[PDB]
């Protein structure tokens, strides 16, 4: 098993798009950041002030675009 980012691992301290929020790219709470498996990207689901009451672990979460497909 290897780190999700092998290009900025040394610069993990710096912000990089490969391992950061897709839109803002900030890290307000990456632990609460969900990634879409079909698109493999992070979503503002956690960047928004209002947090989710519960986070699904067994059920993979898909971005609205996937469901709107």
């Amino acid at each position: 098993s290897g780190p999700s980012c092998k290009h900025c691992k040394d610069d993990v301290n710096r912000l990089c798009r490969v391992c950061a929020c897709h839109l803002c790219g900030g890290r307000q709470d990456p632990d609460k950041q969900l990634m879409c498996d079909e698109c493999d990207m992070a979503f503002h689901i956690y960047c928004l002030d209002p947090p989710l009451s519960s986070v699904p672990s067994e059920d993979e979460w898909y971005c609205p675009e996937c469901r709107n497909d």
């Binding site: 999700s4 969900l34 990634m35 699904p56």
Partner: peptide
């Protein structure tokens, strides 16, 4: 859901 192996909160 999927998360990154590296996170700001890391423990030994």
């Amino acid at each position: 859901a999927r998360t990154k192996q590296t996170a700001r909160k890391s423990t030994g």
